[PDB]
Structure 1
C-alpha cells in the first residue's frame, strides 16, 4: 500500500513499469517490477549514488517477496516513440544535437565511475517536455546478463550491439556504449535504424557491408576473437556521405569516430563532448 498504480507505462527486458503515486509523499514515480552467486542487489543499490541530470534518477531499490522493484523519477516518453511520432518530418537537427550532447554527458559521468550500460537503445532513453533526455536502465545488463528474449518473450534487439560483443570478446569496455550511441545518432538523423540485424550474423554482416570487413590493420587482434571466422566475406568500406545524409561534415566526422571498429580507438564520451560538432549546441524544447 506504499505506492498507488496509476497506469502501466512500459515493458523492458526484465520487467514491467507502472506510473505510481507515493501514498505518503504525493510524488508521482515510475515503478519497475522485476520477478526474482547474486551480487545484483548490491550493484543495483550502488546506482542510487550515481546521480546526474542525464541519468534517470533512481529513487529507491526495494527487494521484497522475491521481486526487485526500482523506483525512478517519472519521465513521459521514450526516444523510440518520439522518433516514430516524428517520422513525417524527422527530429530537427538542433534537437538531435542537443540530445546527443546530453546523452554523451550522461555516458561520460557513468564511465568516469567505471559503470557501463552495455544495452543502450532508443527505448531506454527518456525525454521530458522541457528538452532533457536521460539514460534509463544503467546496471541491469551487467546485473542480470542480456538474454535472447525479454520476460514477455520478445526478441532483445541486436541493432545497437558493438562488434566486439558480437565477435565474442570476454571483456567489454565503456566503448560498447559509445558504439550504441553512434547507432542511435545515425538513426535520429536518417529516420531509419543504421544496422537492423535480425540475427547475430546478420547484425555483423550489416556492420561489415557499411564499415568494411575489419582486418588486423584497422583492428589489431580481430582475427583472434572467439567468433571471428576467416570465411567472413570481405566487403569494402562505404563513404559516410552515403550512410548518414544529410549530416554536415562535423557530424560525419564525429559519427565515424563513434563507430571505429577497435574499442581502444573509438572516441570516449569525454572527447566526443569537445568535438566541433557541438560548437553551436543549444537546448531546444520540443
Structure 2
C-alpha cells in the first residue's frame, strides 16, 4: 500500500511525506510538534500535517503518543476533528521514529469569528448546539476533553463547528479562564461535566462580549467564580477530597448565588436559563450534554435522531506498565491498522 515519499527541509525541520500532500507551508506551533498547511491532492481539500515532536523520548512520551493516536482514530463525528490520515516514512518497526498526523486545517477559531462580525442570538444557538452535539458523542465514550476554549473550536463560513485539541496530559491566562474550579484547584476526581462548565464560560462570553472569569490567578479566578455562583454548600464540601482545599473554602466569607438574569441583562431568557444550569458549582448537579441538547434554547436545531453517540472506547491501556519500545510498537501497530475515511 506504500506511497512514494519526498523529503524537504522547511523551517529547518525535515519533513518526509507522501506525494499526495503538496505545497507544505509552516503554520507553526511549539513543543507538541510542528505543523504545516498543505494541499491534499487525494481529496482536493486543505489539511494540517503535524510532525510529532519526539514521540518516543521517554516512557511518558511514548504513552502520550499512543494515547493521542488511539483517541484521534476513534473520533468520528461531524463536530469533532477526526484523523484524515496518519503515516511514517519508516519502512519497518526497527526504523520507526517519526509520526505524522493529518487532519482538519482550521480556517478560523471561535475568537476569529467574534473578531470579524457581531453574532446574532441565532449564531450563538447553532454554535453552542454543535459544541454540545460534539460533546454528547465524546462523553458517551467516557472521554473528557478537559480543555475547551475558543481557540480549540474551529468554525467555517457556514457556521459549522468542530472541537479540536483534546487535553491529553496525564499532566493571567486563557485556558484557566474556561476551566471548572474543581480541576483548576485539584479538588476532586472530576467528571465529564467539567466540559459543560467550559461551554458555559464560552456561551456567556459570546452573549455579552466579555470573558466571564478572567482571573489573574487561581485565587482571583475562584473569587470571581464564587461571586457569581455563591460559595460551596455542605453537600459539595464533603465531596472535596483535599483537607486543605476544604479548610480554605471554610475560611471564605459565605456568598449567595447571584441572579443570572441580573448578570446577563437583555439576553434570551432561554439562554440565561441554560447558563444557570451549566454554571453550577457542584459537578454532580450540572446539566449534561445530552440534557442540554433538549433545552428550549436549541428548539430550532435539536434533533434526537441526529445526535449520535460513539462506539465503545477501550482505555484499559492507561493502566498498562510497558517499556518505551512496547509503547512504540503499539503505536506502530496503530499506524499500520489505520483505515482512511470514505471518498
Map 1:23-172; keep pairs closer than 5 Å: 26-36=44-54, 37-38=59-60, 39-46=63-70, 47-62=72-87, 68-86=99-117, 90-138=118-166, 141-142=167-168, 144-145=169-170, 157-172=175-190
Indicate the structure (1 or 2) with the bigger Cα radius of gyration.
2
Q: Report which stretch shifted further, 94-103 or 231-240.
A: 231-240
- 1:256: which partner in 2? 276
Aligned residues: 268
Asked if the contact 1:16/1:34 (under 8 Å) is kept, the reply is: yes
- 2:191: which partner in 1? 173
1:83-122, CA deviations, whole angstroms, 9 ceiling, x for partnerless residues?
Answer: 1223xxx311101000111110100001001111100010
Give the TM-score taking structure 1 as reference length: 0.83
- 1:149: which partner in 2? none
Using the TM superposition, give the Cα deviation of residue 209 of structure 1 relative to its aligned residue in structure 2, in angstroms: 1.3
- Structure 1 unaligned regions, length at least 5: 147-153
- 2:289: which partner in 1? 269
Asked if the contact 1:5/1:18 (under 8 Å) is kept, the reply is: no
- For residues 166 and 24 of structure 1, do their structure 2 counterparts lie closer, same or farther at Cα, with a shift above 3 Å needed? closer
- Structure 2 unaligned regions, length at least 5: 1-5, 7-16, 91-95, 303-343
Q: Report which stretch shifted further, 243-252 or 64-73.
A: 64-73
- For residues 16 and 120 of structure 1, do their structure 2 counterparts lie closer, same or farther at Cα, with a shift above 3 Å needed? farther
Using the TM superposition, give the Cα deviation of residue 40 of structure 1 relative to its aligned residue in structure 2, in angstroms: 1.9
- 2:267: which partner in 1? 247
Q: Distance in 2 between matches of 1:62 and 1:175?
A: 34
Q: Report which stretch shifted further, 272-281 or 104-113.
A: 272-281
Q: Distance in 2 between matches of 1:256 and 1:176?
A: 15
Q: Distance in 2 between matches of 1:20 and 1:245?
A: 45
Q: Distance in 1 between matches of 2:254 and 2:218?
A: 17
Q: Distance in 2 between matches of 1:62 and 1:172?
A: 34
Q: Distance in 2 between matches of 1:169 and 1:61?
A: 37
Q: Distance in 1 between matches of 2:229 and 2:34?
A: 36
RMSD of aligned Cα (Å): 2.6
Q: Distance in 2 between matches of 1:110 and 1:160?
A: 18
- For residues 205 and 61 of structure 1, do their structure 2 counterparts lie closer, same or farther at Cα, with a shift above 3 Å needed? farther
Match of 2:300 among 257, 260, 280: 280
Give the TM-score taking structure 2 as reference length: 0.70
Asked if the contact 2:185/2:218 (under 8 Å) is kept, the reply is: no
Using the TM superposition, give the Cα deviation of residue 281 of structure 1 relative to its aligned residue in structure 2, in angstroms: 3.6
- For residues 66 and 84 of structure 1, do their structure 2 counterparts lie closer, same or farther at Cα, with a shift above 3 Å needed? farther
Q: Distance in 1 between matches of 2:86 and 2:181?
A: 33
Q: Which has the higher helix share?
A: 2
Using the TM superposition, give the Cα deviation of residue 171 of structure 1 relative to its aligned residue in structure 2, in angstroms: 1.8
